[PDB]
Ligand binder design. Structure first.
Ligand code: C2F
Ligand code: C2F
Ligand code: CA
Ligand code: CA
Lengths: 262, 262
């Protein structure tokens, strides 16, 4: 399980201000803390508030790699900002993301290959986020074929079925688990899977509990990565424990510690 | 998710003495505590220490139903003990258990049917516990066929893949999840599944964490019931959260309390 730190996101007040005032301190501190928690990748989202998003992404990249060697997950719907971020990246990167829309596929897949970066693909297109697992799977397969079409190693493709809040979109959770399981059954080399975990508990009571529980469930269905709260110790425990229960990581009494220091 | 209180088991020192001394207090207290925790079924195991296991099982049934209306899960390898127990039960019972051995099947399935009781079936026989999910599933299918043969409603059949410690039999864990998953399919009306959860963390560190992490993972694979620590609040939280994430129970802010007071 690859935990992709979610905190460096412009939606958060302290990050929005840091980006605006170009104050590296807050961002660099969240990079450190998240890595200390066990994250091995860092999601970098400038947010919708900042004016120049291209320049902002570049900045987030430069200030972050100054204090971290972790993989940078460039999170933005602005492809120009993504490209700009990649050109500044000193370490392996992740593109977050592309969807099944053909127009975006032919821009992001080649872009991912050009930079040897990982690519996150959402199971959806202009038509919207499908509920039924069969439809989500269909989009996933289109992404799979795309990885082969453009020469992207299947292992660098992370398919995201898009989890939603369990209190107002509850019927989506099981459809997500089913999609992940179907994707897990694909032949070698099979693609990977990811999820913006925290969305499952939006507006719910005891979000950490919901987050933990779903992470464990998702991992049982093949989940390989999760953009989530790397500073949530209980969550990190689950990640570590889940790997053990899937026999992905050999057991030892300090399995939690080993996960955070590997 | 049906939590079957595991605590009234002769292997525990206090229960062993209570049975040997015929002191109802310890047993009745544990019965009430487990129900309050959220259990809706109580496992009753006289343990190996007591000499007369048939009258010990009758006693457990007597002192327990005296204070509890909960379904009683008669846990014994001695069929005479199970029979004597069933005859003492005033409420519907559960039989734990029968394995896939034909000789055992033709005695227990008819016994469960006669008493209108639930029956637990272990995916194993005289050759032992199969590690590979293929063989676990093979025995699971025999049990399903036997239920049809003897007239046991498929919903009263709980198949147990038999989980083992994650520190010495770690490769069994993923096989158990796969088996549960394949069982979840088969054909409607599909049978139910159960597990002696606590075995997964035996002799491990951070046992509660390992238990609840696996419970969640198991539930995503269709687990229906679990013999476990109904007095472990964190375990109960996981069960309640898992039902929500599978859309088996409608979300509401106090879903945990609702699960417990259900
Ligand atoms: C849509 N999510 C997502 C993605 N990328 C992919 N590939 N998939 C996804 O599902 N990128 C962004 C987001 C994941 N990150 C996050 C980050 C924070 C919160 C969150 O819980 N935010 C708080 C904000 C609190 C504040 O404003 O101070 C919230 O309550 O909404 C959720 C998901
Ligand atoms: C084999 N388990 C089991 C079953 N029935 C079915 N169908 N399936 C199962 O896996 N019945 C009994 C047991 C379930 N109950 C339990 C009860 C206690 C512990 C446990 O953790 N015991 C302690 C011993 C504590 C003491 O002796 O004081 C241990 O660490 O071993 C595990 C499972
Ligand atoms: Ca996987
Ligand atoms: Ca089931």
């Amino acid at each position: 399980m690859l935990i992709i730190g979610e905190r460096i996101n412009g939606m958060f007040g302290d990050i929005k201000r840091a980006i605006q005032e170009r104050d590296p301190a807050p961002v660099q501190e969240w990079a450190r803390r998240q890595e200390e928690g066990g994250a091995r990748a860092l999601d970098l989202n400038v947010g919708p508030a900042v004016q120049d998003k291209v320049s902002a992404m570049e900045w987030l990249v430069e200030v972050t790699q100054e204090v971290s060697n972790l993989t940078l997950c460039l999170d933005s719907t602005n492809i120009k900002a993504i490209e700009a971020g990649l050109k500044k990246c000193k370490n392996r990167a992740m593109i977050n993301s592309t969807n099944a829309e053909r127009e975006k596929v032919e821009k992001l897949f080649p872009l991912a290959v050009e930079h040897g970066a990982a690519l996150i693909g959402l199971t959806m297109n202009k038509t919207g986020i499908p509920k039924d697992s069969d439809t989500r799977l269909a989009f996933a397969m289109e992404l799979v074929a795309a990885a082969d079409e453009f020469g992207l190693p299947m292992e660098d493709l992370y398919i995201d079925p898009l989890i939603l809040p369990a209190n107002v979109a509850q019927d989506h959770a099981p459809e997500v688990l089913k999609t992940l399981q179907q994707i897990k059954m694909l032949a070698d080399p099979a693609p990977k899977t990811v999820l913006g975990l925290s969305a499952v508990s939006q507006n719910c009571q005891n979000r950490p509990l919901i987050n933990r529980t779903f992470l464990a469930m998702a991992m049982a269905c093949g989940l390989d990565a999760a953009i989530a709260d790397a500073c949530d110790e209980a969550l990190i425990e689950t990640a570590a424990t889940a790997e053990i229960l899937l026999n992905q990581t050999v057991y030892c009494d300090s399995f939690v510690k080993m996960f955070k220091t590997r």
